[PDB]
Ligand binder design. Structure first.
Ligand SMILES: NC[C@@H]1O[C@H](O[C@H]2[C@@H](O)[C@H](O[C@@H]3[C@@H](O)[C@H](N)C[C@H](N)[C@H]3O[C@H]3O[C@H](CN)[C@@H](O)[C@H](O)[C@H]3N)O[C@@H]2CO)[C@H](N)[C@@H](O)[C@@H]1O
Ligand SMILES: NC[C@@H]1O[C@H](O[C@H]2[C@@H](O)[C@H](O[C@@H]3[C@@H](O)[C@H](N)C[C@H](N)[C@H]3O[C@H]3O[C@H](CN)[C@@H](O)[C@H](O)[C@H]3N)O[C@@H]2CO)[C@H](N)[C@@H](O)[C@@H]1O
Ligand SMILES: Nc1ncnc2c1ncn2[C@@H]1O[C@H](COP(=O)(O)CP(=O)(O)OP(=O)(O)O)[C@@H](O)[C@H]1O
Ligand SMILES: Nc1ncnc2c1ncn2[C@@H]1O[C@H](COP(=O)(O)CP(=O)(O)OP(=O)(O)O)[C@@H](O)[C@H]1O
Ligand SMILES: [Ca+2]
Ligand SMILES: [Ca+2]
Ligand SMILES: [Ca+2]
Ligand SMILES: [Ca+2]
Lengths: 252, 253
């Protein structure tokens, strides 16, 4: 019947059950256990799942247990300290979406401040990595998206335009999050938090109103809204020094 | 940069061969093969399409990519050792229908020993069990969690996320059906349009896709009905096709 309603107290009872099972199964190879996601922020809603992370002493440990009981869902990630720290210091195009997990850790088990170390590593990422990730996002994501809707304008399909518009607004949100080096609280609040940030690219907020409201059927408006956002991107990047290399026809 | 410019297939192929020559010049006999994938590999590139190319290296553990723009056009070249590429071609993730069409239409431009054919043969020869597992994982990892997200939206918001979530659910359903039929979608723009003409869809999916394809995503009440109907169709569909996971234990490890 899909996920059921659960209270915060029931989810924490489940968490401590998982904690005991982890400690029983892996014992002294467990360095730390934490809850992240909305339960880690103590903002989980009725239908929220449980996300837990485990620091293992075993070197090269990298596995996950993800399951449902038919009523609720749990995900537990098991990483060696090195693998977890290296992932926490790595900045992809979706870093604002993903790395909020290291800012929300509720420690449940910790033998030596490992969860604090993970948090310190995530909040201390060098500014250059956000610069590089922003330039990568423009090339690998926004430029490709611009080709996709320009193709749609000349040859369709307009049936893809609503989905693409959603993706573009999300990519724009990642761009803003990388620029402010702030992680969004949750996925559902990515767009609502993005448009309250300072320093938006021209045309971004207008595009987001289509995605947030769901009024994505006027495909001519959407293409014009995408173009204005794309135009504002070049002005915004030049104004913030996120300059993309266009000088080499073949850069290797 | 003025964004992507109009380019013809002839111009894009001229660019491909310039890249091939530079790859062959730089890596010499460590290049086992070079091929084109994406819409240019299918010779269906549109005016604003970019260029996607693959390269098989003999160097062990080679795994890098060069992706760049000139301000007018964009290129991506992926370099993989044969082993890494054959391994990647034979793993089935939740997004296999989105990603692995690349191995079925490679336009060959350089090949020292049928490596491009070997990649294709590897991609088509994946065991049925790998699709079964990917489908069961997808239900747990993606659909069940999406169901909680829209149920959370109904009770505590935000509805401003609902159009986006609905797009994501339609895409995941498209992966689900593509995994079921072992069909890879052509390009991202055709994922939903091809998913809905597949036989034996879960009940409520085509209606959900009609919301997403038409862009009529402002009626939060109707979307929530539609997501629930599709979620119901999933329970019927998986359970009728044997995509069953044991869910009886509170902690299954
Ligand atoms: N190449 C074979 C294998 O690919 C894997 O990565 C796969 C996937 O992650 C990766 O996706 C990469 C991302 O990462 C990176 N952040 C930007 C890049 N444009 C995107 O590329 C892919 O998605 C784009 C659509 N948005 C497509 O336009 C593009 O043609 C496609 N190669 O491309 C690969 C599939 O083509 C691993 N590298 C490795 O297991 C092995 O190399
Ligand atoms: N965990 C530390 C690091 O995680 C990485 O993977 C990251 C990412 O791909 C991975 O994503 C995994 C997927 O893969 C897997 N196929 C389904 C699973 N629901 C999803 O989980 C992630 O996405 C969900 C939202 N859709 C979130 O609810 C979930 O909490 C989040 N961990 O979770 C990790 C981030 O939390 C690498 N494994 C490795 O660098 C190292 O293990
Ligand atoms: N695609 C993704 N990949 C990796 N991490 C992600 C992710 N999406 C979200 N996250 C990270 O993983 C955490 C848990 O994500 P989710 O379970 O999907 C939503 P949540 O933040 O717990 O709020 P919720 O109550 O709506 O569930 C996020 O808070 C975020 O830090
Ligand atoms: N998110 C993704 N990740 C990995 N591969 C993807 C992908 N999306 C699409 N693909 C694969 O990579 C190839 C190239 O994708 P893209 O360049 O993004 C669109 P295309 O198929 O070339 O048509 P188009 O560029 O004319 O719109 C696709 O044909 C497809 O097999
Ligand atoms: Ca969660
Ligand atoms: Ca989760
Ligand atoms: Ca392409
Ligand atoms: Ca591409």
């Amino acid at each position: 019947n899909g996920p059921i309603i659960m209270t915060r107290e029931e989810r924490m009872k489940i968490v401590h059950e998982i904690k005991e099972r982890i400690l029983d199964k892996y014992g002294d190879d467990v360095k730390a256990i934490g809850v992240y996601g909305s339960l880690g922020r103590q903002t989980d809603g009725p239908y929220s799942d449980i996300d837990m992370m485990c620091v293992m002493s075993t070197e090269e440990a990298e596995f996950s247990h993800e399951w449902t009981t038919g009523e609720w869902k749990v995900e537990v990630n098991f990483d060696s300290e090195e693998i977890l720290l290296d992932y926490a210091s790595q900045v992809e195009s979706d870093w604002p979406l993903t790395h909020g997990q290291f800012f929300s850790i509720l420690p449940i088990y910790d033998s030596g401040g490992y969860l604090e170390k993970v948090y310190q590593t995530a909040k201390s990422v060098e500014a250059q990595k956000f610069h590089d990730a922003i330039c990568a996002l423009i090339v690998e994501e926004l430029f490709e998206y611009a080709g996709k809707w320009r193709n749609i304008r000349v040859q369709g399909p307009t049936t893809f335009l609503p989905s693409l518009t959603v993706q573009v607004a999300m990519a724009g949100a990642m761009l803003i999050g990388l620029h402010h080096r702030i992680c969004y609280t949750t996925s559902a609040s990515v767009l609502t938090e993005a448009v309250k940030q300072s320093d938006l690219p021209s045309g971004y907020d207008h595009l987001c109103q289509f995605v947030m409201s769901g009024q994505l059927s006027d495909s001519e408006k959407l293409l014009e809204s995408l173009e204005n956002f794309w135009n504002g991107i070049q002005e915004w990047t030049e104004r913030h020094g996120y300059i993309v290399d266009v000088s080499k026809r073949i850069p290797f």
